[PDB]
Amino acid sequence: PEGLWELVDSGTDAIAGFPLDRGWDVEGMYDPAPGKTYVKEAGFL
Amino acid sequence: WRRRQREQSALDDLRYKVTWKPTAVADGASATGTWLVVVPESLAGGGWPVVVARAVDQAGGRPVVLSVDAADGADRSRLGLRIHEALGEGPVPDAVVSLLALDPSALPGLPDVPQALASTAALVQALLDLGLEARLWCVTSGAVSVSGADGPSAPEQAAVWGFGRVAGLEHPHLWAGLVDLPPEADERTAARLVGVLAGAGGEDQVALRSSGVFVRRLVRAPASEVPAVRSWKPGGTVLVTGGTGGLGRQVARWLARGGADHLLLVSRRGVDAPGADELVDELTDLGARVTVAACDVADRDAVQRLLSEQVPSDAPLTAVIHTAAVLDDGVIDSLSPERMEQVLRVKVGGAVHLYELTRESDLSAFVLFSSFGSTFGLPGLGNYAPGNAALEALAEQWRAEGRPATAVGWGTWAGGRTHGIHELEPALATAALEQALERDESSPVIIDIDWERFAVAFHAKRPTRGFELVPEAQAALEAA
Amino acid sequence: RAQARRLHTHLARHPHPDPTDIAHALATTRTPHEHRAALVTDDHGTRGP
Numbered sequence: 001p002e003g004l005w006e007l008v009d010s011g012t013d014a015i016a017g018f019p020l021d022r023g024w025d026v027e028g029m030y031d032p033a034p035g036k037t038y039v040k041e042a043g044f045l
Numbered sequence: 046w047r048r049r050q051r052e053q054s055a056l057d058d059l060r061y062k063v064t065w066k067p068t069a070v071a072d073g074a075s076a077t078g079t080w081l082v083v084v085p086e087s088l089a090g091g092g093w094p095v096v097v098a099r100a101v102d103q104a105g106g107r108p109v110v111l112s113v114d115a116a117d118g119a120d121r122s123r124l125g126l127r128i129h130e131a132l133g134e135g136p137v138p139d140a141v142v143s144l145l146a147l148d149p150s151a152l153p154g155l156p157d158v159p160q161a162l163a164s165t166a167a168l169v170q171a172l173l174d175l176g177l178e179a180r181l182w183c184v185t186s187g188a189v190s191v192s193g194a195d196g197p198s199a200p201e202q203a204a205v206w207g208f209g210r211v212a213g214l215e216h217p218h219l220w221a222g223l224v225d226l227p228p229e230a231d232e233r234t235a236a237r238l239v240g241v242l243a244g245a246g247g248e249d250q251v252a253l254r255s256s257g258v259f260v261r262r263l264v265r266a267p268a269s270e271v272p273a274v275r276s277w278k279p280g281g282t283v284l285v286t287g288g289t290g291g292l293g294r295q296v297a298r299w300l301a302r303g304g305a306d307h308l309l310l311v312s313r314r315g316v317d318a319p320g321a322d323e324l325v326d327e328l329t330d331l332g333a334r335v336t337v338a339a340c341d342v343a344d345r346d347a348v349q350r351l352l353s354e355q356v357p358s359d360a361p362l363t364a365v366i367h368t369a370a371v372l373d374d375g376v377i378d379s380l381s382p383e384r385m386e387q388v389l390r391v392k393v394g395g396a397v398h399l400y401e402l403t404r405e406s407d408l409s410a411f412v413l414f415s416s417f418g419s420t421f422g423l424p425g426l427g428n429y430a431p432g433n434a435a436l437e438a439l440a441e442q443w444r445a446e447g448r449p450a451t452a453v454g455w456g457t458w459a460g461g462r463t464h465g466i467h468e469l470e471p472a473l474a475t476a477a478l479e480q481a482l483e484r485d486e487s488s489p490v491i492i493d494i495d496w497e498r499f500a501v502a503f504h505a506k507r508p509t510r511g512f513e514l515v516p517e518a519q520a521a522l523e524a525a
Numbered sequence: 526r527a528q529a530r531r532l533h534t535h536l537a538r539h540p541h542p543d544p545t546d547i548a549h550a551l552a553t554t555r556t557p558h559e560h561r562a563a564l565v566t567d568d569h570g571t572r573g574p
C-alpha cells in the first residue's frame with residue numbers, strides 16, 4: 001500500500017506496453033478491425 | 046512454386062530483430078560501501094549528476110563525485126592519474142558509475158569521434174590499467190528508443206552502447222552493463238537507477254522511462270505474414286559506396302539484376318580496384334549504366350561535387366546504399382582515439398554527409414549496412430561495433446526527420462566467426478534485403494544461427510538473458 | 526537474507542525507532558519459520574552492521 005501511495009501522490013502514470021512473455025502475438029494483434037485492437041499499452045502486472 | 050515456397054521458408058527461418066521487453070520494477074537492494082561516480086565537468090552541478098549522487102547517498106553507499114574536464118576524458122593515462130588521485134587516501138570502490146556519456150559534443154582534433162565514446166574507452170582501459178576490481182556501469186540519456194513514444198535515439202550514445210556490448214563479452218567482471226535514462230532527471234527515476242545498479246546482475250542492457258523499465262531482447266520477426274507495400278523499383282541513379290568490395294559487388298549485381306537504370310559505384314580506388322573491369326563487365330551485361338568512381342566519401346566536398354558532376358541528368362538519384370568502411374580490427378587494450386577516428390570517418394562520416402547533401406532530391410530509400418556485432422558483440426570487435434551501432438540511431442533520427450532510411454543488420458556474407466553464425470549465401474541475403482525493403486522495417490537483422498552451438502557458447506563467454514524470447518535459444522540453454 | 530535486507534532498508538528510513546518495540550513486533554506478530562536468526566545486543570550501534 002505504501003507503493004500505491006507513493007505512486008499516486010507522485011502523479012506517476014503506470015501504463016506501459018503489453019507483456020511479451022505471455023505468448024501474445026503483440027506485433028500482430030495491433031491494428032488502429034475484424035479481430036484486432038487499437039491500444040498497445042495498459043496497466044499490467 | 047515449390048522452389049519459391051521452400052526458399053521463403055528457409056529465408057524467414059533466419060529473420061530477427063531487437064525489441065525492448067517491459068519488466069517489473071525490481072525490489073533492488075542497498076548500496077554498500079563507496080561508489081565512484083565520474084562526471085563531465087561541462088555539466089557541472091546540473092541535472093543527473095547531483096541527483097544520482099544523492100540517490101546513492103540515501104541508498105547506503107558513499108558517493109565520490111569526480112568532475113572531469115572535457116579534454117582530460119580523452120586520454121587514458123591522464124584519466125588514470127585523475128582517478129588515482131581522486132580515489133587516493135580511501136578504500137577501493139565497490140562499483141564505478143560513468144556519466145561520461147551524457148556529454149553531447151565531438152572530440153576536438155578528431156572531429157568525427159564523440160566525446161562520449163572516447164571517454165568511455167578511456168575509462169574502461171584506465172580501470173584495466175589500475176587493476177581495480179570494481180564493476181563498471183555506464184549511464185546514457187536518450188541512447189535507445191524502447192517504443193514509438195520515445196524520440197529519436199542519438200548516434201553518440203548508440204555508439205557507446207555498441208562499444209559497451211562488445212566490451213562486456215570479453216571483460217565480464219569489470220563491465221556490468223548499461224542503463225539508459227530519460228531526458229530529464231527525477232528523484233524517483235534515480236532511486237530506481239541506484240536500485241538496479243546495486244542488483245546482482247543479468248540485466249545488463251536496460252532502459253528507464255516514465256512508463257516503467259525495459260530490457261533489451263532479441264526476437265524472431267518472420268516476414269511471411271507481413272503484407273507488402275511500396276514494392277522495390279531501382280529507378281534512376283542508385284549510389285553504391287564501396288562497390289568494388291565484396292558486399293558492394295553483391296549489392297551492385299543484385300541491383301542490376303532487375304530494374305536498374307544507372308549504378309553509380311563509389312570507392313577510394315574505383316577503376317584501380319582488383320577486379321573493377323571484370324566486375325563492371327558483368328554488371329553492364331545486365332543493361333546497367335555503370336560509372337565506377339574513384340573518390341573517398343568521407344570528405345564533404347568530394348561527395349558534393351560527385352552528386353553534381355557525375356550524376357546523369359537523365360536519371361535522378363533514388364537509392365543510396367552505404368556499405369563501405371575500413372576493417373580496423375583491434376582488441377580493447379590496443380584501442381586508441383585515432384583508430385576510432387579513421388573508422389568513424391568512413392562508417393559514419395560518409396553516411397551523414399550523403400544524407401545531408403540530400404534534402405534537395407527525393408530518395409526512394411537510404412540503406413545502411415550495420416553488422417551483427419552491433420546487435421550481439423563478439424570478442425575482438427572493439428573498433429568494429431560503435432560505427433555499426435551509431436548507424437541505427439542515425440536511421441531512427443532520419444525517420445524522425447521523415448526520410449526513407451534503413452539500418453539493415455548483416456551477418457557473415459559467404460565471401461573470423463566460424464563458430465556459431467554460418468555464412469549467408471549471396472542470393473539468400475539479397476532476397477532477404479529485397480523483402481525487407483518494401484516492408485519498411487527500420488532495423489531488420491538477417492543472420493543465420495545454429496542455436497545448438499551459438500547460444501551455449503555465448504552464455505559461456507558471458508551469461509545473459511537477451512536470448513530468451515527466441516524459443517530455440519531457451520531450448521539450447523535448458524538443454525545443458 | 527531477503528528478510529534481513531528488507532528489515533534493514535525499512536529501519537534505515539525511520540527516525541530512531543524503539544528497539545524493544547521492534548523486538549516485540551518481530552517475536553509476536555511474525556510466524557516462526559524454519560531457518561531462523563537472532564540479533565542480541567544492548568547497544569544501538571551494532572544492530573545495523
Ligand SMILES: Nc1ncnc2c1ncn2[C@@H]1O[C@H](COP(=O)(O)OP(=O)(O)O)[C@@H](O)[C@H]1OP(=O)(O)O
Pocket residue numbers: 286287288289290291292293311312313314315318340341342343368369370371372390391
Ligand atoms: N573512405 C572510403 N570511401 C570510399 N570507399 C571506401 C572507403 N573506405 C573503404 N572503402 C571501400 O570499402 C570497400 C570494402 O571492401 P572490403 O572487402 O575491404 O570490406 P567489405 O568486406 O565490407 O566490402 C573497399 O572496396 C573500399 O574501396 P577501395 O577498394 O577503393 O579501398
